Design a protein around this ligand. Structure first.
Ligand SMILES: [Cl-]
Ligand SMILES: [Cl-]
Ligand SMILES: [Cl-]
Ligand SMILES: [Cl-]
Ligand SMILES: [Cl-]
Ligand SMILES: [K+]
Ligand SMILES: [Zn+2]
Lengths: 193, 17
C-alpha cells in the first residue's frame, strides 16, 4: 500500500517536538486508498505503512526517506497517491515531491562537523561528523532509543540539512555511530542519478 | 560494530509485545 504520514516533528539552539496526526486504523485505511486529506506541517514527517514506520525529511521541496523503509511505494496525498520523484536503490534513497504544507530544510553549505541527530522521539542529540556518511554519537545510547528514526535528519549548527539517518553502528546493542545518506547524494540524485 | 537497521512497527507509536 501507500506510505502514509501519521505525524510530524517540527524543529525550533536546536529543539524539536512531535505531534500525532493519525491513528492505526486510519493509517491502514489511508494506505489502501492512497488518499490523504490531512493538513501537513513541519520539516520531518512520521510515516508508516501497514507493516513498518520511520521518518521522512523535507529538503528543498522534496520529502526524502530510506528505500529500506519506503521501497517503491507511493505517498498518500490529497489528490491520491504520489509517485516517487526519485528512486535511488544503491544509495538507499527515495524522494516524493513535498506535500504543500511541509516545511523544507535547505542543504548545509557551511561544512561544520558539529551535527545534531533528530530522533523519532524528537530528541536532538550531538553527532560528530567523521567522513562523508558516518558520525559518532558523542553520547552513546541503546539502539532501542534510535528505533523508528530511519530517514530523520542530521543538521548542522545553523539548522541546515547534512543528511538523512540510515543505520546505527552498534556494539552489543549500544549505538556508537550513525550511518547516513549525505545531502550531496540528494543533489547527485536530482541531477542526475 | 555492526550496522543495525531501525524500522519500527506500524503506526505513530508502534505496539510492542
Ligand atoms: Cl487517522
Ligand atoms: Cl476525495
Ligand atoms: Cl483523509
Ligand atoms: Cl515496494
Ligand atoms: Cl549551513
Ligand atoms: K494510534
Ligand atoms: Zn551548515
Amino acid at each position: 500500500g501507500s506510505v502514509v504520514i501519521v505525524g510530524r516533528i517540527i524543529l525550533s539552539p536546536i529543539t524539536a517536538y512531535s505531534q500525532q496526526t493519525r491513528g492505526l486504523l486510519g493509517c491502514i485505511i489511508t494506505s489502501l486508498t492512497g488518499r490523504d486529506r490531512n493538513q501537513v506541517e513541519g520539516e520531518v514527517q512520521v510515516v508508516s505503512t501497514a507493516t513498518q514506520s520511520f521518518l521522512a525529511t523535507c529538503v528543498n521541496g522534496v520529502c526524502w526517506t530510506v528505500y529500506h523503509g519506503a521501497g517503491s511505494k507511493t505517498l498518500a496525498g490529497p489528490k491520491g497517491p504520489i509517485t516517487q520523484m526519485y528512486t535511488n536503490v544503491d544509495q538507499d534513497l527515495v524522494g516524493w515531491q513535498a506535500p504543500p504544507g511541509a516545511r523544507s530544510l535547505t542543504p548545509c553549505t557551511c561544512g561544520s562537523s558539529d551535527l545534531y541527530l533528530v530522533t523519532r522521539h524528537a530528541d536532538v542529540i550531538p553527532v560528530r561528523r567523521r567522513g562523508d556518511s558516518r558520525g559518532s554519537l558523542l553520547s552513546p545510547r541503546p539502539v532501542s532509543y534510535l528505533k523508528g528514526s530511519s530517514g530523520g535528519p542530521l543538521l548542522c549548527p545553523s539548522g541546515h540539512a547534512v543528511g538523512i539517518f540510515r543505520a546505527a553502528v552498534c556494539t552489543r546493542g549500544v549505538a556508537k555511530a550513525v550511518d547516513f545518506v549525505p545531502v550531496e547524494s540528494m543533489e547527485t540524485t536530482m541531477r542526475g542519478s | 560494530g555492526r550496522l543495525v537497521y531501525l524500522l519500527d512497527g506500524p503506526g505513530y507509536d508502534p505496539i510492542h509485545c
